[PDB]
Amino acid sequence: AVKLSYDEAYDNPSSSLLSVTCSDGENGLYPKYRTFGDLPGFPCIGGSSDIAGYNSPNCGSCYQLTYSSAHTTPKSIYMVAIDRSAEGFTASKQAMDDLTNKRAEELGTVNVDVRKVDFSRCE
C-alpha cells in the first residue's frame, strides 16, 4: 500500500493547470485542460510521487486507489494525477471523503492499494 492524503487546493475547479507540475510541454495538461474543473472526473484529481517533475510521462495518468476501511467494505476512487506529491498520493478533499465515507479530515492520511488503470476509468 501507499499513503493517500488530501489538499483542498484540488477542490477549486477554477485553478489553472499552469499551477501544477503537469502544466504544459509534451506531457502537460495545459492547454488541453485550462482549469482543474475541465479535467475528466473532476474533483477526482491530485498529486502523486510518480510525477517526478515537469513533463513526467505519468502526467494525466489514472490511478485506482482502494481503501479498505476498518468498519466497511472496500471502496475505490479513480484519480487523475496532475501534480507532484513527495510520497504517495494527495487527492482533493471531495475524493478522499468519497473514498473514506466522509472521514478525510478526521483521518488525514490513509493507506490505500494503488493500480494504474486505463484513463477511461477516470472518465
Q: Is 118 flagged in the annotation as binding? A: yes
Residues numbered 46 to 105 that lie near Zn ion (CB under 5 A) are 50
Q: How far is the CB of 55 from Cl ion (least distance, A)?
A: 19
| Closest CA relative to residue 14, chosen from 40, 35, 38, 41 | 35
Strands 62-67 and 2-6: unpaired
Min dist. Cβ of residue 59 to Cl ion (A): 14
Which residues are within 8 A (CB) of 86 and not within 5 positions of it... i.e. 6 or more apart? Answer: 49
Region of 9-17, 30-38, 101-109, 114-122 interacting with Zn ion (CB under 5 A): 114-122
114 touches Cl ion (CB under 5 A): yes
Q: How far is the CB of 2 from Cl ion (least distance, A)?
A: 5
Window contacting Zn ion (CB under 5 A); options: 14-22, 33-41, 76-84, 113-121: 113-121
With residue 95 as reference, give the H or E element that holds it: helix 93-100
Beta bridge partners of 77: 65
For residue 42, which of 3, 7, 5, 79 has the smallest C-alpha distance?
Answer: 79
CA 36 to chain centre: 11
Question: Is there a binding annotation on residue 26?
Answer: no
* Residues that bind Na ion in the complex, under the rule CB under 5 A: 105
Annotated binding site for Zn(2+): which residue ranges? 50, 87, 118
Annotated binding site: which residue ranges? 50, 87, 118
